[PDB]
Amino acid sequence: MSVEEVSKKFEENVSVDDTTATPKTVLSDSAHFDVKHPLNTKWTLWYTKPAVDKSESWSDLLRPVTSFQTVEEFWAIIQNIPEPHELPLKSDYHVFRNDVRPEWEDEANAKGGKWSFQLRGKGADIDELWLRTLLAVIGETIDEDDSQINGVVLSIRKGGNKFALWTKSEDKEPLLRIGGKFKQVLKLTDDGHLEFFPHSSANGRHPQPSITL
């Protein structure tokens, strides 16, 4: 049947009196201190190889997979080093979960924006350094980025690599600042080429995005 005592314990007023609940905790556990593979966030791994969506479906190509809180897995997609000008270009990798993670169609819905960077000059080893910065930004206890952002993405094209950074809402202010740096990490210079667009682009780009080098 349904039976419940009648005592109730309402006596935990500690708004500004420090957490006196020292000996009384719900879970005194905090491993953390990893940085050896497992970071501290959840991020799925959806990468797109083909592009037959023309007749198939952008969702029929994109392969959603590896969803962990470490770096070994993400490093795996890089282990193939197909991004640094090693694959059939037109590539598109995506990993995230912090605040959103539905897809470029809603990852912007996350309430952040989509920073892209179209590279032309070939370096043969640029997608490895820019990735270590994206895959690490997810968490890697880096702070100052794995919390204000929501997810990242990567995509190559005919002689035109293109990466994507999906913020969670940090505001374009800190983006025009980050994008600027992330724009150089690509090791470019021909014209600081790059693209700045808020979710408003993946859902009705009525207003203006940000810029496009």
105 binds ligand M7G, rule: CB under 6 A: yes
Please report how close the Cβ of residue 195 comes to ligand M7G at its closest, in angstroms: 11
Q: Which is nearer to ligand M7G, 164 or 188 (CB)?
A: 164
Contact letters (x/-) for ligand M7G, 4-43, by CB under 6 A?
----------------------------------------
Output the furthest CA–CA distance in the chain (Å, rounded). Answer: 75
Gap between the Cα atoms of 63 and 57, Å rounded: 12
Gap between the Cα atoms of 200 and 113, Å rounded: 8
First to last CA, the chain: 69
150 binds ligand M7G, rule: CB under 6 A: no
Q: One-letter amino acid identity for 86?
A: E
Q: Which is nearer to ligand M7G, 70 or 201 (CB)?
A: 201
| Among residues 38, 42, 49, 58, the one that binds ligand M7G under rule CB under 6 A | 58
Selected range binding ligand M7G among 51-59, 65-73, 123-131, 171-179, rule: CB under 6 A: 51-59
Gap between the Cα atoms of 140 and 35, Å rounded: 6
| Among residues 103, 145, 146, 170, the one that binds ligand M7G under rule CB under 6 A | 103
Contact letters (x/-) for ligand M7G, 71-90, by CB under 6 A?
-------------------x
For residue 179, give the 3-state DSSP assignment. Answer: helix
Taking the CA atoms of residue 151, residue 94, residue 136 and residue 101 in that order, the dihedral angle to the nearest 10 degrees is 30
Q: Which is nearer to ligand M7G, 51 or 81 (CB)?
A: 51
Please report how close the Cβ of residue 164 comes to ligand M7G at its closest, in angstroms: 8
Cβ neighbours of residue 90 closer than 8 Å, sequence gap 6 or more? 51, 155, 156, 157, 158
C-alpha closest to that of 117 among 213, 35, 198: 213
Instruction: Please give the residue ranges that form the binding site for ligand M7G (CB under 6 A).
Output: 51, 53, 58, 90, 92, 103-105, 155, 157
